[PDB]
């Protein structure tokens, strides 16, 4: 799987009946992916590991997008993970800040490529939780739990360099 | 004894310490105490009757566990026989000096403690029974002019009465 | 031959040290890792041998 | 006479074991596959720590013996002469051929110099059985052993009880209920299907 900017989809599914069993159980999952053609496919990936079904022996009843409930309120997210490196297979827990659940997850897949260099086909996502200001075990996020917070914008580089390319004024990097 | 309460062969020789005084914890609550049928009042009454002069002197302890009346002869106080001929009596309530008379004046107790040992801790004609009864000159003493650590290379008596 | 306190002061700078087994170096006596890049901060040390 | 082991590390050729078709091979350098107080009942030595493999390769009889000895020495010096029981869970059944060029490349089919053992991933090579206060010494022992093998191995504790196949949390209850019997260095499970005379003998 590749990635763009991700989205959350609610997919719920069922096996196929037969003269033995008439109404089998339903099964729900919560999935993050670009669009609905891939999410259906990731669904059969997981549900096959857990239970004993396949695509020919089942049907997709509903697949739909779930929208954020409060997208203008800053939130703290906590993420539980399974990936596999070049040697073994590992678990972990990570924390982030964002407005939307989608954006936090997206923010992970980048981060893992950078620290640990894992491609998306090597990652499984179990659970995501809106965490309080407490219960945050990681300091990078606790820096920002301050009612009276401030800081400056120190050394600020010139963007827009090739607007004038040959000048006379040497720049200024103090504001 | 294994299958049920069958007292056939239980006479045993165990080891305790903290000194043979009446104490606040009494020094008579070991782990081997509650195996041996000893209530707390009598097991001290025998110990204080047994600890009469010869010897009231604090030794570590020893106890040949019998049923009721348990004798405890003087153990192998060998660092403490440096001092256990202290001018008696000194039991309790009059002990302002820890062990500080400095009046052992080694003249006879060296060889008398040497023979008093029951051929214990030695493969020698009492040479080790001198050595390990001299291993503890920390707070010891000697003749009024003699000091430890600069007399320990001389012997001036006869080894005929050793065992 | 020499006053003991001065003698101690000399031995400070010429006898009380640790030695990497690889790079054959000198280190302060309270060390656990070498200082050189030739060995890789190697964590394998001994003390210096005092005269008999 | 012996070569390095980079020449024979990978599982290239098919198995060619010792049988009526292959004759003329020596024996192996290892002959003993377990040590320690190998008689202890199931209750004395409940803890098990394993060595596990992570490659598909070949291991030699020499390697196994060297590893066997290094572990025994330290384990003695740490705990005791009878504080443990150790077992090796591999056997050298596959054979190695050598073509000696003292013709050239004509008539090439070797001579059976050697024996070696094959490994799959997840298999077990070594295992130790002892008590719980001696956990870290067990780990230290095996760690000294990995430096005798060509590969990447790793160590883990088992949830089981000893060299059995039952979970520790269940075992202890399950022996006080007459499903498991301690018949030696192992156990013996028994179900509710046989003839009752064995239920009469028990429960009495």
């Amino acid at each position: 799987k590749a990635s763009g900017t991700l989205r959350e989809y609610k997919v719920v599914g069922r096996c196929l009946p037969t003269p033995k069993c008439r109404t089998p159980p339903l099964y729900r999952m919560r999935i993050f992916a670009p669009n609905h053609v891939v999410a259906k496919s990731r669904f059969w990936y997981f549900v096959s590991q857990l239970k004993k079904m396949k695509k020919s022996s089942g049907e997709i009843v509903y697949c739909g997008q779930v929208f954020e409930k409060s997208p203008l309120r800053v939130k703290n997210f906590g993420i539980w993970l399974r990936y596999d490196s070049r040697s073994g297979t590992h678990n972990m827990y990570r924390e982030y800040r964002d407005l939307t659940t989608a954006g936090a997850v997206t923010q992970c897949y980048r981060d893992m490529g950078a620290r640990h260099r894992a491609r998306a086909h090597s990652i499984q996502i179990m659970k995501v939780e809106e965490i309080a200001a407490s219960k945050c075990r990681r300091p990078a996020v606790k820096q920002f739990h301050d009612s009276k917070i401030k800081f400056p914008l120190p050394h600020r580089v010139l963007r827009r360099q090739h607007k004038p390319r040959f000048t006379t004024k040497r720049p200024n990097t103090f504001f | 004894m294994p299958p049920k309460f069958d007292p056939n062969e239980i006479k045993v020789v165990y080891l305790r310490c903290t000194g043979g005084e009446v104490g606040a914890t009494s020094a008579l609550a070991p782990k081997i105490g509650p195996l041996g049928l000893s209530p707390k009042k009598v097991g001290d009454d025998i110990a204080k009757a047994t600890g009469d002069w010869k010897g009231l002197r604090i030794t570590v302890k020893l106890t040949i566990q019998n049923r009721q009346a348990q004798i405890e002869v003087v153990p192998s106080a060998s660092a403490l026989i440096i001092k256990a001929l202290k001018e008696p009596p000194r039991d309790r309530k009059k002990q302002k000096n820890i062990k500080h008379s400095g009046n052992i004046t080694f003249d006879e107790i060296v060889n008398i403690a040497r023979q008093m040992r029951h051929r214990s801790l030695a493969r020698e004609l009492s040479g080790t029974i001198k050595e390990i009864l001299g291993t503890a000159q920390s707070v010891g003493c000697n003749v009024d002019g003699r000091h430890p650590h600069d007399i320990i290379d001389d012997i001036n008596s006869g080894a005929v009465e050793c065992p | 031959i020499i006053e003991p306190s001065l003698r101690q002061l000399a031995q400070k700078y010429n006898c009380d040290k640790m030695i990497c087994r690889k790079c054959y170096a000198r280190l302060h006596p309270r060390a656990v890792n070498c200082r050189k890049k030739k060995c890789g901060h190697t964590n394998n040390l001994r003390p210096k041998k005092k005269v008999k | 006479g012996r070569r390095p082991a980079r020449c024979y590390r990978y599982c290239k050729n098919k198995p060619y074991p010792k049988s009526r078709f292959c004759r003329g091979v020596p024996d192996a350098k290892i002959r003993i596959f377990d040590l320690g107080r190998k008689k202890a009942k199931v209750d004395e030595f409940p803890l098990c720590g394993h060595m596990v493999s992570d490659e598909y390769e070949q291991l030699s009889s020499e390697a196994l013996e060297a590893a066997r000895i290094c572990a025994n020495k330290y384990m003695v010096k740490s705990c005791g002469k009878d504080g443990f029981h150790i077992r090796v869970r591999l056997h050298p059944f596959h054979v190695i051929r050598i073509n000696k060029m003292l013709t050239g490349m004509r008539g090439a089919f070797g001579k059976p110099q050697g024996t070696v053992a094959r490994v799959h991933i997840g298999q077990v090579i070594m295992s130790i059985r002892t008590k719980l206060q001696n956990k870290e010494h067990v780990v230290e022992a095996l760690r000294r052993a990995k430096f005798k093998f060509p590969g990447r191995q790793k160590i883990h504790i088992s949830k089981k009880w000893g060299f059995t196949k039952f979970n520790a949390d269940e075992f202890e209850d399950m022996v006080a209920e007459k499903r498991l019997i301690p018949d030696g260095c192992g156990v013996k499970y028994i179900p509710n299907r046989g003839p009752l005379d064995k239920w009469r003998a028990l429960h009495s």
């Binding site: - | 606040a24 002990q95 302002k96 000096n97 820890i98 | - | -």
Partner: protein, 198 residues
């Protein structure tokens, strides 16, 4: 470790301070525990004697249950090296006791010179090894048939100095140390009434 040792002290020292009213605290100067060790032969558990740690900074938990006054009035008095010596007994008697209940008092150097120094008109010890120790200071060293007998009566040391290596090795090695004191009386716990030891 520190598991069962302090699991006692979750409530043990709390219990000591609640149920049994009056006490003393003994300050420990730069001292070896010989005094705290062989104080056994000064007294017994008439009440108890036990120096511990600085748990006497943990007093909000102690006044939590409203046990006894005069408890919280010690936090400045404990910045390091102090203990606690418990007696529910006659006041002025134990005052006089721990004024000078400090016998062993061994330390090579570091302490004070409390009183005036006098003529050493005694035989502390003779050494034929070397006489430079006396020749350096330059006092009468009349030799009368090997031995050395001094008769000069003059003043050498006076109160308010700082001890040096010379007299430090002197007072260790020659079996004389009028130099160290062990553990002194300084406070009063009258169950709530705070006054001085006059």
């Amino acid at each position: 470790d520190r598991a069962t040792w302090k699991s006692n002290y979750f409530l043990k020292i709390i219990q000591l301070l609640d149920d049994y009213p009056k006490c003393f605290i003994v300050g420990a100067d730069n001292v070896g525990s010989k005094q705290m060790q062989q104080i056994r032969m000064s007294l017994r558990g008439k009440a108890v004697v036990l120096m511990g740690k600085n748990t006497m900074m943990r007093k909000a938990i102690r006044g939590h249950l409203e046990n006894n006054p005069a408890l919280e009035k010690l936090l400045p008095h404990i910045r390091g090296n102090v203990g606690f010596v418990f007696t529910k007994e006659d006041l002025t008697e134990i005052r006089d006791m721990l004024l000078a209940n400090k016998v062993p008092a061994a330390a090579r150097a570091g302490a004070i010179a409390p009183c005036e120094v006098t003529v050493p008109a005694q035989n502390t010890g003779l050494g034929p090894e070397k006489t430079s120790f006396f020749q350096a200071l330059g006092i009468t060293t009349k030799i009368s048939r090997g031995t050395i007998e001094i008769l000069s009566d003059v003043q050498l040391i006076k109160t308010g100095d700082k001890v040096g290596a010379s007299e430090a090795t002197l007072l260790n090695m020659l079996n004389i140390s009028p130099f160290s004191f062990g553990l002194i009386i300084q406070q009063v716990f009258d169950n709530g009434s705070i006054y001085n030891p006059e």
